[model samples]
Target: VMTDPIADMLTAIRNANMVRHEKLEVPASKIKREIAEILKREGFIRDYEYIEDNKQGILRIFLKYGPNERVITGLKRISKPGLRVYVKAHEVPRVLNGLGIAILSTSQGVLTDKEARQKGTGGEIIAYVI
Candidate 1:
């Protein structure tokens, strides 16, 4: 039994990373969109929307997962470390060579629009489906 949806979401994210590396030349924006689609299709996320936060230079993806508040809280807390690792390990290297902005699944439940402008290390929160 999966105790945390974030964990499952991360798994899906890693899977997406593999796919991105192997197949398409995925851009930052496209990564977020694809991640959201994957989460929705896998039942990890429910109602979700992607918005480009031009002002903040971040792609915000709001997620409405479960009805419980605990999930949101835990997500915020645990995601920081997870995101840091993901960024350092996967996203940074891929996008560093001007491939594109490094995509980040943030704890605030949003994806970064531009890595350099937003100072986003990587790992964007595409959705929050419980």
Candidate 2:
């Protein structure tokens, strides 16, 4: 009955972050791994690993903290299964005036706003993390 797996993934992370948890384990998929990679690159997370397991596997994300303080302020899912969002290169949305990050699923790959701009690509607006 999981309608939006990506949203579920983000919600898992958010729930962990709320309790000040240091790590989060989420059911994995290729796109989830890609999103995790993007979060790691954007410095929102300390690190992550794609664990081989039965079925789709698992993604262990190490939430980032500034001296034991929560680094991830929030997580927001933009596009959903019901409402697909697509954006052009020139129309890439900025998150928090560069303070936050907007992850996009482009033809090139899943990328952060900066990477997407650099690569001159844009597609679905996946999520936002501040």
Candidate 3:
């Protein structure tokens, strides 16, 4: 079993993106799917879909690339299972001067920094996708 599924998922995408992979698959769960949704919404990735296989389902994330390189520059896990980090509504950061996005887990659900700020709510900082 994975102790930190979120980190696993994040690193999977991170490693794949670093190499400019076209797509990646990771073990699927609700939270992971929600995170994919947020990434898709924020234009970090091209698209994603949940696939159900015999044993279980998985997520297939389509990576986006521009002229020179990948669209997603980097991904960093801010709040890990061992060290949890929380942020207030007004304190949410503007990633890379609005060039990147900070994903957050809020009461409303997993949202980007812009979405969380717009909602005036806050929760654990999940990761940053640049």
Ten contiguous residues with the weakest lDDT in model 3: 1-10
Off by over 4 Å in 3: 1-3
Q: Could you tell which candidate, 1 or 2, scores higher by TM-score?
A: 2
Worst lDDT window (10 residues) for model 2?
Answer: 1-10
What does the lDDT read for residue 84 in candidate 1?
Answer: 33
Ranking by TM-score: 3, 2, 1
Which structure among the candidates has the greatest TM-score? 3
Model 1 clash pairs are 45-129, 59-113, 104-122, 104-123, 104-124, 105-123, 105-124, 105-125, 106-124, 106-125
Q: Put down candidate 1 lDDT per residue, 1-130, tens digits, no spaces.
A: 1114445544544443333322121223434455555444544344345434443323233333344322122222133444433443234333343222222454433343343235544453333322
lDDT of 3 by residue, 34-99 (tens): 889988987889999998888889899998888848777778777876878899988988666757
Cα displacement (angstroms), candidate 1, residue 68, comes to 1.7
Misplaced by over 4 Å in model 1 are 1-28, 55-58, 64-130
lDDT tens digits, residues 1-130, model 2? Answer: 1227888899999988888888988887888888888888878899998786776678899988898888888888888878778899999876567578888888887888888889999788888888
Q: Candidate 1: lDDT of 52?
A: 40
Clashes of each: 10, 0, 0
Model 2 clash pairs?
none
Worst 10 residues of 1 by lDDT: 69-78
